[PDB]
Design a binder for this molecule. Structure first.
Ligand SMILES: [Mg+2]
Lengths: 100, 1340, 37, 84, 50, 51, 50, 251
RNA sequence: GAGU
DNA sequence: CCGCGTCAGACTCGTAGGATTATAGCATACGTG
DNA sequence: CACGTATGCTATAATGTGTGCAGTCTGACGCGG
């Protein structure tokens, strides 16, 4: 076999579209929501250190501009496959299992 | 009777005088395509239609434009014959005159700027043959007509869509020929919606807002009105008696001074009529009643000028009071009723989120183009361009017509674009249907299903090619120069030619003609298919469309359609049925006026048929008076019953019209179950023509018609006497009265000899006339492959007995006598086609030399110097046909071969071996070879020899043409010269080359000489150009595929004799496989000594319910009995008189024989030729439902001195003793089907394997293994046979090392299993890992 | 050759790189002339 | 690019030829127009031979593709392996 | 029911080979499931002895 | 018959017996001269009446 | 159908009796071709689960 | 692969991969050029679209189509459905030592026999013939034995007759609904191209001779031969496993 | 198109 | 609940090959015998 | 240097897609509002 180095990360469609969502089920994030993030319609908050803005909360393009000046710095919200991968990477399954 | 019928007359048992003869059977195909090419001046048809539809087109800028003038088809570069041989498409070049006109921008419409007019080529269009085929890449192909849902309007409703509720949701669908679909539908809440191209759903009122309708107007359209006058204090309402019906009276209904109904009382008929008779108009009513009535129009306060209430607003006591005091003492509310006049649009307006027209256009725009910012321009443009643009929308005349009649309009034809009325009226009818008045249509009704033939489909694809080129044209016109740019530089032929080639090639409806039988061709071309593009799919097909519909009567055969998944979809046309001008089906009926049945015939469409009551053809006529019986059996509204005589409007023309062509050929169909008859007619199509064309004894009459109309037989254009008969051709000299005064008047028919069919059968035409015989116009001169003296001869009749025989006829199996094989009557001819291609590879060109490594002298003996087998040569599997060699590259020789080739020297040469050889177990005689070389490559010696033949034979053929034309032409001049200056033998003395210098007196006969003189020189110069053409084409170096240097095609002819495993059948759906060929000694034989030919199992009759075969056998025996009586009389040679007496009595036997055949008109010699043919067995015609009855058949048996039972005493050929009881014995006409065991038998030990999966390939032609499928695996698992299973999974399939090891072991005796892992599994893992799933084997 | 069992798990980017014996950086299949890779 | 552009001029020339001849042009007819070798024209037209998918099912019927028929020519034969 | 019972067997090769193959495989891949090849289906797929 | 034979005698006897039955069955079937003509299909006089 | 076929095969059916026969015949024949898939699919599911 | 005619034929996967590579490599270019983010976005969506098409085409939206109109066959399509690897190439396989023909009756046959065309059997038992030819010393080598059987020599008929004795062959008729749709028989060589079937087992096959055909399979190993003779032989398997009734019944 |  | 989506839909045999379009024109640049 | 393959530049103004098809199948089983 060989391989290809992708410049930008990409979602595995089977673990996205093939229901149950798996990726959506794991993040507890509606499928539509994930997709708006992936296709770059809207941003998702990966870590809002300020509890003012919580995790996995979708922001439109103009929503990202408002808190940009206001809070900024202390909230990290991104767009696309990168955002979702990062959100996935940073979720600690043990802890949230016990919480749930 | 005609001259050909004088030779052999069929005896007719029909009783019903045929008012109408069967039409030309290949009507559909020919008429259609004729109309497609036919250049219609005004009423555009086919090609003309396509040009006018698209053209004239203008540029994007609008300054430059292309306009269409006229088109013309070039005559075809290669004729049909040449096309078939070469493998080219038979087509005509399409040249079209076009005019490039340019407008000035500074002048207003300066049309006199630049006008360039010229003729451009753009594609060759395939032409239709004389018999309705197309020749595409050298093979005959037929485009089968299609059947689809007619454009127009259609109302339907899913009967309980939500199964929980089970509420009926009605819908309207407007279906155009070209455009978006427009759907109206109800929802559960009775709100009307609209959808375009079934997108998301929109309130129906939104579309009317697009059409600029305010709320007030919309309600005025769909609703009626209830008026409320407010007088003094009490409220008054304007009343229509028949509104208050089926209701409960809510208040005390009274008028002037009479109280009618009380509170809470049911309003029946009687109350309504009382009220209506009294003439009641206004009624005093309670104010509290209004709460809930919806106001129709807007009302404003004239004082303030503000809205008191908007339209479609529910009224209440406050509003009412307010309205009264503003000064409105009359209020229009919506007439409405839960039951009858349903308030749908009212409720739908409440759901409609749009306000004004513009807002409605935006929402429509936002449906189809969601997300995208709407602009007003774009919304207006979109909506107009959907259904209101000439370009993108077109109902077609058919659509408009069907639509107008569905709406009960008066005007048929009209606009292809939707008008505002049209939409509204469809909504109205939908609403009507919802209320309860009106009914929904069905799709299966032939009034809603339309037939689309070749011409219209070619027209459609041609339009597409035009439209693609149109894009390119507009683009190039915009940027293009006005002056330098020619019109033909912008046009590309490729898109058009591509679209058409792709239709006649890639399309499902275009398929290899089925030609293993005249009937097969004829019925195939009369086929209708619901499949293909713009039609149903097998998957998508339900059961309703498939099944037999009432409308099928007289139009579609109910008994002709495949038992495959194509069961309902493919169907043959009924006999007398025809394509309506708009595309619907229609059937002939005889008009009955006042009981009296006129001979005027009317073709009724499906829709029109429902209107009239039509008597059956079986009704007994009272000698051109009326119906004999007072009660008559008829049908109307799709249902059948008794009527009086005067009530009858029409009657069926023929008894045959219910069935198709195929089914009509089945005699005694009346006594066969339809299942079996379906298979009978289907299998009749697969009958392979035998060596000897035998007519059927027990026929129907349709035999003659089919044969002649199929076109495979050569028939006479003009009657006259036959000047020269030959195996290869027939020259007939025409009679003076029919013979044109121009030409010599001698017709020449070259007969097509031994040629290959698509099913590798043999197509040969035999002459059926004697030299110097007078022949009538439209008589058969030469018989096609399965025809006999003009009649259809698909199989061969023979002596059959029904009885078991030692299980050799177990489950339909057939025991046949050696005699049949000896006489080679079922033996068949097959012409197979083998090709050797010499390609140019990277290493160098392949050569077709006889110089091949490792070839025996025995092999090379039959090959010439070129390396090509000789004509005439017998070959058998393994023999080399065309020697070919290929340049082989390096190969790493194993150390063993290094050592061995060092030992023997024998260093392996540069050339390999790719010679074409006989495929194994086929064996026959090389009857022809054809060679194709490119234009530049030095030709083979054999290729030159073939060209020598062609050139010299072509010269002979053309020379005989001018010779017999010159001879017939001077024979006329000789006669014209006699009319005036008669010197018969004195003119013939000095040579004929110096003849035309002699004239006559200045009269019209002197002008006749000028005409023959002008034509004679014309023929002289014409012969020069014809021969130049011939010579060019023979010399012409063929343009083959790139890479291919030269190709050699060999045609083998194989003689295949019948054997066990071959498949045979009658016409009643009785199949069977030959099990054993019994020696004639063993065959059952009658008292007389005559042995039976076949013994069929009688246990395959009662289950099957095909009794036609038994009737056929009894009638068959009687037919033969009379044949033997005639034969006996001919051998004795009694006298003409005696033969004539017997034969007259015989023809005039039946109770009410239709056809009378008086032998007194026949001259003595004519009687002799007739009897000569009848000796083999007197042929009898049993029409389909008008057939021979038992009484008639028994009477025929008595004339043959045969038993009335038709059972006879038979003796066992083995023992000599008689069988215990009489057996039914007679002649059944049987057929040998295409399914020869030869083609079916296959076996393989080891061979090639598949590419990725590694398991053996499939199919006999690719030397494949059988599939052992999941089903087959489970069998072995059930049994528990573990090793056999594993064997088939591993060593027999993928396991590579295992299979080789196993093979070595088997050759070394030890049957050891050495199994491993199937390679396909490995592949699977890799496919899963390519998916990005880690799937690993954790080992033990 | 002969194993006991089969496991399916998620493919890590790193795991995919392990199977690979080369990175395919070009769409080119073969050469037009010398039909070689 | 060179091959592609060459091939395209062969094509455009073919189009002009076809307009006026009424007939789509032979390899040698195009070659005579360019005053060039027929081998050149032929090789270029061979390169224009466009691909067929191995997976495309055959005969207007979603029955089986080219792969289903296509052999491995290099791989002999338990016969051949056992003979070695 | 028969369909779900077959999908519920611990063998994912049996389940996947039956139907629903895309879903079955996502399930098993995420679970890290291992099939030790007890059933007949499973063995036939790998070309082993029943 | 076959079943009874299987239960009492066993496999081998039944196999032989089955073949034997087949041979004689066909053999007598042929000798009989059994056939199917239009006259066997007897009609009932009470056909018209019932209808 | 409300009107049954009164006639028989030896006597011979008329046009309309034959036509009437067709509906039922064809329905049956189509059922062979089309419904066996569902029968066989049942077989397959049973087999898979057992 | 190159077809004989100079044509090339490729898998759809190669087309799909070519799209992915092109888009990914353009993305690397756009990043090297530091392009504006709207263009970076379009390319990233493009990349995802192509990958998704590669893995499972007609899943997410419109399947990417060929010039034929037909959706390209992606990876998942090769595993999925009937045409998929499992169903088509793994739970069922094409098999060596298999043949097929038209069938006809064999009234004369005994219950454990079937009529097997000579020509068919000659091919099916090819390696056994070669092995025996070498033990007889008639064939010097395998290549010579091959040419000897091609010529179909009279001694080869006698040898073939020797081998087929006591060797069971499997006859199968589709559809194979129950296990008796495959049964084993001792072959009886016959001149003529159709297979002859014993009447009494027509029931089990649902075989009627209106043109039916049957498949022949050769159990190769001593184990398979024994399985056929013991478990699958027609004589041994009389009773329906469904109800306790004899399935071989005169008809 | 061939048996189911 | 409603509505929108995804998933299944018998077994062997056959026939036959095959389709479409178009990318300017010229000067410098890189790699191999 | 040549031959094969590649990279490159061109200057009236031109500045948000569409296009070609899909034809509507069916009874069941889950999944967000
Ligand atoms: Mg059968």
């Amino acid at each position: 076999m060989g391989h290809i180095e992708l410049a930008s990360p990409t979602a595995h469609i089977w673990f996205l579209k093939s229901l149950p969502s798996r990726i959506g089920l794991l993040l507890d994030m509606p499928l539509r929501d994930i997709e708006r993030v992936l296709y770059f319609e809207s941003y998702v908050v990966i870590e809002g250190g300020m509890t003012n803005l919580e995790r996995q909360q979708i922001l439109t393009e103009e929503q990202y501009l408002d808190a940009l000046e206001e809070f900024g710095d202390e909230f990290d919200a991104k767009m696309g496959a990168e955002a979702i991968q990062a959100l996935l990477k940073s979720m600690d399954l043990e802890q949230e299992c016990e919480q749930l | 009777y005609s001259y050909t019928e004088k030779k052999r007359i069929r005896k007719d048992f029909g009783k019903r005088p045929q008012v109408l003869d069967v039409p030309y059977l290949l009507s559909i195909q020919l008429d259609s395509f004729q109309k497609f090419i036919e250049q219609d001046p005004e009423g555009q048809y086919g090609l003309e239609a396509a040009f006018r539809s698209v053209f004239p087109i203008q540029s994007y800028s609008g300054n430059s434009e292309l306009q269409y003038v006229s088109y013309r088809l070039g005559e075809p570069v290669f004729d049909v014959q040449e096309c078939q041989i070469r493998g080219v498409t038979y087509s005509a070049p399409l040249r079209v005159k076009l005019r490039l006109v340019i407008y000035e921008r500074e002048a207003p419409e300066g049309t006199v700027k630049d006008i360039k007019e010229q003729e451009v080529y753009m594609g060759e269009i395939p032409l239709m043959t004389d018999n309705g085929t197309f020749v595409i890449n050298g093979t005959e192909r037929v485009i089968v007509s299609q059947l689809h849902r007619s454009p127009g309007v259609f109302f339907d409703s899913d009967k309980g869509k939500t199964h929980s509720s089970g509420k009926v949701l009605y819908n309207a669908r407007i279906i155009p020929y070209r455009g978006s679909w427009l759907d109206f539908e109800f929802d559960p809440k009775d709100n009307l919606f609209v959808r375009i191209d079934r997108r998301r759903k929109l309130p129906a009122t939104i579309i009317l807002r697009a059409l600029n309708y305010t709320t007030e107007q919309i309600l005025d359209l769909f609703f009626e009105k209830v008026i409320f006058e407010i007088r003094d204090n009490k409220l008054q309402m304007e009343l229509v008696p028949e509104r208050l019906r089926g209701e409960t009276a809510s208040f005390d209904i009274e008028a002037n001074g009479k109280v009618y109904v009380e509170k809470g009382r049911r309003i029946t008929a009687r109350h309504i009529r009382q009220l209506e008779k009294d003439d009641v108009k206004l009624i005093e009513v309670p104010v509290e009643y209004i709460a809930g009535k919806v106001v129709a129009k807007d009302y404003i306060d004239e004082s303030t000028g503000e809205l008191i209430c908007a339209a479609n607003m529910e009224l209440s006591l406050d509003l009412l009071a307010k309205l009264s005091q503003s000064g409105h003492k009359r209020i229009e509310t919506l007439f409405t009723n839960d039951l009858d006049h349903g308030p749908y649009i009212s409720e739908t307006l409440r759901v409609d989120p749009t306000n004004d027209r513009l807002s409605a256009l935006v929402e429509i725009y936002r449906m189809m183009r969601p997300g995208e910012p709407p602009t007003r321009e774009a919304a207006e443009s979109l909506f107009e361009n959907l259904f209101f643009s000439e370009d993108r929308y077109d109902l077609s005349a058919v659509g408009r017509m069907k639509f107008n009649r569905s709406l009960l309009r008066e005007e048929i034809e009209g606009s292809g674009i939707l008008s505002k009325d049209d939409i509204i009226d469809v909504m109205k009818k939908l609403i009507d249907i919802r209320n309860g008045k009106g009914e929904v249509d069905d799709i299966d009704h032939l009034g809603n299903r339309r037939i689309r033939s070749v011409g219209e489909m070619a027209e459609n694809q041609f339009r597409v090619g035009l439209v693609r080129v149109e894009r390119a044209v507009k683009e190039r016109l915009s940027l293009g120069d006005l002056d330098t740019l020619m019109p033909q530089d912008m046009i590309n032929a490729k898109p058009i030619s591509a679209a058409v080639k792709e239709f006649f090639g890639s399309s499902q409806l275009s398929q290899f003609m089925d030609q293993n039988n005249p009937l097969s061709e004829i019925t195939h071309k009369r086929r209708i298919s619901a499949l293909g593009p713009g039609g149903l799919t097998r998957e998508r097909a339900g059961f309703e469309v498939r099944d037999v519909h009432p409308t099928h009567y007289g139009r579609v055969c109910p008994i002709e359609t495949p038992e495959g998944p194509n069961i309902g979809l493919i169907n043959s046309l009924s006999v007398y049925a025809q394509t309506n001008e708009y595309g619907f089906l229609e059937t002939p009926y005889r008009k009955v006026t006042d009981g009296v049945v006129t001979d005027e015939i009317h073709y009724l469409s499906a829709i029109e048929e429902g209107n009239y009551v039509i008597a059956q053809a079986n009704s007994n006529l009272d000698e051109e008076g009326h119906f004999v019986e007072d009660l008559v059996t008829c049908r109307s509204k799709g249902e059948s019953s008794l009527f009086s005589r005067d009530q009858v409007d029409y009657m069926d023309v023929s008894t045959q019209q219910v069935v198709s062509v195929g089914a009509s050929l089945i005699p005694f169909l009346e006594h066969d179950d339809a299942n079996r008859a379906l298979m009978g007619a289907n299998m009749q199509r697969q009958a392979v023509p035998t060596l000897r064309a035998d007519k059927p004894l027990v026929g129907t009459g349709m035999e003659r018609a089919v044969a002649v109309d199929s076109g495979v037989t050569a028939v006479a254009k003009r009657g006259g006497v036959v000047q020269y008969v030959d195996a290869s051709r027939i020259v007939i000299k025409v009679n003076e009265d029919e013979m044109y005064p121009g030409e010599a008047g001698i017709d020449i028919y070259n007969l097509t000899k031994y040629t290959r069919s698509n099913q590798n059968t043999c197509i040969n035409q035999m002459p059926c006339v004697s030299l110097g015989e007078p022949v009538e116009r439209g008589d058969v001169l030469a018989d096609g492959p399965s025809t006999d003296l003009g009649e259809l001869a698909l199989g061969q009749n023979m002596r059959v007995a029904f009885m078991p025989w030692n299980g050799y006829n177990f489950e339909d199996s057939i025991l046949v006598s050696e005699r049949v094989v000896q006489e080679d009557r079922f033996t068949t001819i097959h012409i197979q086609e083998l090709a050797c291609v010499s390609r140019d590879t990277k290493l160098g060109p392949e050569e077709i030399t006889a110089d091949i490594p490792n070839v025996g002298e025995a092999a090379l003996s039959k090959l010439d110097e070129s390396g090509i087998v000789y004509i005439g040569a017998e070959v058998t599997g393994g023999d080399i046909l065309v020697g070919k060699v290929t340049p082989k590259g390096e190969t790493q020789l194993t150390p063993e071969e290094k050592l061995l080739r060092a030992i023997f020297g024998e260093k392996a040469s540069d050339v390999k071996d790719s010679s074409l050889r006989v495929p194994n177990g086929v064996s026959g005689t090389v009857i022809d070879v054809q060679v194709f070389t490119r234009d530049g490559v030095e030709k083979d010696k054999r290729a030159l020899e073939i060209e020598e033949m062609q050139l010299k034979q072509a010269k002979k053929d053309l020379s005989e043409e001018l010779q017999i034309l010159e001879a017939g032409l001077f024979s006329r001049i000789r006669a014209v010269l006699v009319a005036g200056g008669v010197e018969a033998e004195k003119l013939d003395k000095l040579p004929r080359d110096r003849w035309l210098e002699l004239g006559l007196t200045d009269e019209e006969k002197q002008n006749q000489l000028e005409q023959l003189a002008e034509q004679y020189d014309e023929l002289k110069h014409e012969f020069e150009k014809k021969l130049e053409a011939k010579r060019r084409k023979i010399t012409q170096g063929d343009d083959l595929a790139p890479g291919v240097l030269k190709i050699v095609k060999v045609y083998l002819a194989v003689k295949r004799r019948i054997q066990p495993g071959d498949k045979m059948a009658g016409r009643h759906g009785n199949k069977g496989v030959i099990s054993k060929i019994n020696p004639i000694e063993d065959m059952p034989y009658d008292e007389n000594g005559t042995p039976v030919d076949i013994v069929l199992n009688p246990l395959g009759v009662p289950s099957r319910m095909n009794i036609g075969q038994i009737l056929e056998t009894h009638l068959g025996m009687a037919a033969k009995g009379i044949g033997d009586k005639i034969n006996a009389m001919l051998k004795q040679q009694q006298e003409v008189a005696k033969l004539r007496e017997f034969i007259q009595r015989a023809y005039d036997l039946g109770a009410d024989v239709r056809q009378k055949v008086d032998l007194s008109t026949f001259s003595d010699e004519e009687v002799m030729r007739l009897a000569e043919n009848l000796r083999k067995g007197m042929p009898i015609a049993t029409p389909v439902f008008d057939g021979a009855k038992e009484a008639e058949i028994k009477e025929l048996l008595k004339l043959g001195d045969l038993p009335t039972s038709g059972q006879i005493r038979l003796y066992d050929g083995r023992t000599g003793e008689q069988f215990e009881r009489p057996v039914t014995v007679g002649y059944m006409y049987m057929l040998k089907l295409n399914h020869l065991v030869d083609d079916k038998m296959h076996a393989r030990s080891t061979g090639s394997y598949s590419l990725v999966t590694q398991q053996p390939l499939g199919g006999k032609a690719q030397f494949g293994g059988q599939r052992f499928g999941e089903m087959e695996v489970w069998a072995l698992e059930a049994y528990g046979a573990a090793y056999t299973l594993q064997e088939m999974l591993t060593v027999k399939s993928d396991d590579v090392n295992g299979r080789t090891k196993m093979y070595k072991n088997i050759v070394d005796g030890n049957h050891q299993m050495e199994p491993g892992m199937p390679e396909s599994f490995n592949v699977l893992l890799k496919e899963i890992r390519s998916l990005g799933i880690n799937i690993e084997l954790e080992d033990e | 050759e002969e194993f006991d069992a089969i496991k399916i798990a998620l493919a890590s980017p790193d795991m995919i790189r392990s199977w690979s014996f080369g990175e395919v950086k070009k769409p080119e299949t073969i050469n037009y002339r010398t039909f070689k890779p | 690019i060179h091959i592609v552009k060459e091939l395209n001029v062969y094509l455009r020339t073919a189009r002009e030829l076809s307009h006026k001849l009424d007939h789509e042009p032979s390899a040698e007819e195009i070659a005579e127009q360019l005053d060039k070798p027929v081998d050149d024209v032929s090789r270029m037209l061979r390169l224009n031979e466009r691909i067929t998918s191995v997976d495309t099912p055959l005969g207007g019927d979603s029955e089986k593709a080219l792969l289903d028929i296509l052999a491995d020519e290099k791989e002999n034969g338990p016969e051949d392996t056992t003979q070695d | 029911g028969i369909t779900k019972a077959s999908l519920a067997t611990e063998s994912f090769i049996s389940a996947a080979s039956f139907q629903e193959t895309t879903r079955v495989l996502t399930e098993a891949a995420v679970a890290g499931k291992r099939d030790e090849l007890r059933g007949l289906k499973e063995n036939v797929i790998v070309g082993r002895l029943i | 018959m076959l079943n009874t034979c299987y239960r009492i005698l066993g496999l081998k006897p039944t196999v032989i017996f089955a073949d034997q039955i087949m041979y004689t069955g066909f053999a007598y079937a042929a000798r009989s001269g059994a056939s199917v003509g239009i006259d066997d299909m007897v009609i009932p006089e009470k056909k018209h009446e019932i209808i | 159908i409300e009107t049954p076929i009164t006639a028989n095969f030896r006597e011979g059916l008329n046009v309309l009796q034959y036509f009437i026969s067709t509906h039922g015949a064809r329905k049956g024949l189509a059922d062979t071709a089309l419904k066996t898939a569902n029968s066989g699919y049942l077989t397959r599911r049973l087999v898979d689960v057992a | 692969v190159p077809l004989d005619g100079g044509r090339f034929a490729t898998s759809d996967l190669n087309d799909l991969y070519r799209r992915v590579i092109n888009r990914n490599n353009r993305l690397k270019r756009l990043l090297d050029l530091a392009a504006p983010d709207i263009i970076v976005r379009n390319e990233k969506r493009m990349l995802q679209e192509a990958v998704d098409a590669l893995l499972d085409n007609g899943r997410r939206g419109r399947a990417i189509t060929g010039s034929n109109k037909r959706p390209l066959k992606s990876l998942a399509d090769m595993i999925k459905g009937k045409q998929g690897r499992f169903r088509q190439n793994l739970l069922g396989k094409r098999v060596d030592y298999s043949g097929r023909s038209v069938i006809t009756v064999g009234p004369y046959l005994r219950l454990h026999q079937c009529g097997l065309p000579k020509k068919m059997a000659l091919e099916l038992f090819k390696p056994f013939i070669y092995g025996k030819l070498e033990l007889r010393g008639l064939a010097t080598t395998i290549k010579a034995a091959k040419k000897m059987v091609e010529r179909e020599e009279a001694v080869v008929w006698d040898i073939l007759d020797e081998v087929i004795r006591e060797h069971p062959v499997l006859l199968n008729r589709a559809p194979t609904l129950h296990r008796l749709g495959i049964q084993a028989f001792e072959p009886v060589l016959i001149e003529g191209k159709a297979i002859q079937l014993h009447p009494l087992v027509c029931a089990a096959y649902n075989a009627d001779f209106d043109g039916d055909q049957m498949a022949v399979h050769v159990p190769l190993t001593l184990e398979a031969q024994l399985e056929a003779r013991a478990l699958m032989m027609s004589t041994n398997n009389i009773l329906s496993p469904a109800n306790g009734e004899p399935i071989i019944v005169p008809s």
